[PDB]
Symmetry: D2
Subunit: 138 residues, 4 copies
């Protein structure tokens, strides 16, 4: 596994309470040898005025997953910061929960590149994103 | 003036009530000849686990200002959809409110490219992003 | 089989003569069921002042493969234009030839998203890129 | 004045001789208080098969100015390496020369973010990009 920190999903979700992650009910549901998955509802706090999932919400999910995964790949006082993020909106979502799957593209000593694919309840690709991080010690 | 539709800040803000923008208390506060600005609180709703402004929060603001601006540059039954969004997080925020300034880079018949710069309350650049949109019907 | 145009590697390379692709000796070497590959030398026309591959050349390579791949997925009068491109430089190359491997992330009737990976002669990842295109008639 | 190293345009241009920038006739022509500008011809060397400026070419120009500008804001044996590049292609060039204007968005101790806008001979925006760099010392 690419993970360096031994932390459970329970702890992960716990850490989101009190901040944006908990506010949007973004929940981590699976972690594999090299993948991290989280879900996010398509509701009043994530929808645009016309009932569609707000594209901004999809990036929050993507950046949220990518940054914790990167963090999980560092040690102790090391921290991870999002330097650059981009995403392609290819499919709209209107209900249920969307699912983001995060996988590494590059894992370095000072930088990481994560790819996050988010799908609707029927498994269709709604958003594809890439996050670039910096590993820092302050 | 780049706008093709008429609208009030009051109307704009009213449309976010009950959905994402409204629950994040993102408010449109200025509409110029070719610029649109909105602010967003820096708090529990928009912070990441370690107390700083969530990078996704910044993208939410950018996509919100950029998409509405895009819409106001279309006519009739025409609509705007976000295709691609990219952003460079240059500085973090810890409190108060940040403000996004949105100006056009390209206003085509089928596509638009919008630049949204977000600043902290001291005027320092925190995020630089670009939203590419498509103009569609139906 | 994602292509809608039947054109050989010979013809693709032929089309590159007289323009940038030919100038840099970018050569397509493989067309798969859903992948396109081309190599580019690391020499005087693609190196920075210190013998390393110019990060710009890797992007030229990426956009070239992605745009032709996108083009190959359209038909007749339709053309493909690059709207957004992003690339992460993870390792620089010093010699021989590098190889770009392009695969689709999304193929729509109006837009496409391609991911291009560039490796050195040793198979190590040097540049990872993403190209967003628009399908136009004009 | 953001500059930390002393240089002349004559020196800058001389360094591209024999390598990529030199063969593309990219020429640095202005150094401002916090800006760097260079032009590049729209010809056989920088065109794609259908006669228009190669989007990859605009990235080459962007990364060239951005990387040197970054190096000019460092000292001693410090050096600059490009981390991530992203660009929005908004207009296609057919002839003459395009010119890129590079300005800083962030000048940190370990990272830099540069904005490069490329215009055609009529002053119209053709490409807007951002280069993120890492300051290294070895």
């Amino acid at each position: 596994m690419i993970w360096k920190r031994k932390i459970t999903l329970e702890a992960l979700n716990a850490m989101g309470e009190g901040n944006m992650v908990g506010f949007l009910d973004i929940r981590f549901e699976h972690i594999g040898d090299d993948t991290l998955e989280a879900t996010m509802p398509v509701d009043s706090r994530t929808k645009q005025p016309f009932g569609l999932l707000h594209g901004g919400a999809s990036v929050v999910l993507a950046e949220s997953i990518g940054s914790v995964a990167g963090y999980l790949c560092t040690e102790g006082e090391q921290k991870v910061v999002g330097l650059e993020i981009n995403a392609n909106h290819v499919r709209s979502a209107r209900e249920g929960r969307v699912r983001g799957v995060c996988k590494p593209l590059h894992l370095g000593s000072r930088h990481q590149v994560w790819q996050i694919e988010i799908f609707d309840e029927k498994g269709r690709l709604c958003c594809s994103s890439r996050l670039t991080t910096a590993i820092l010690l302050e």
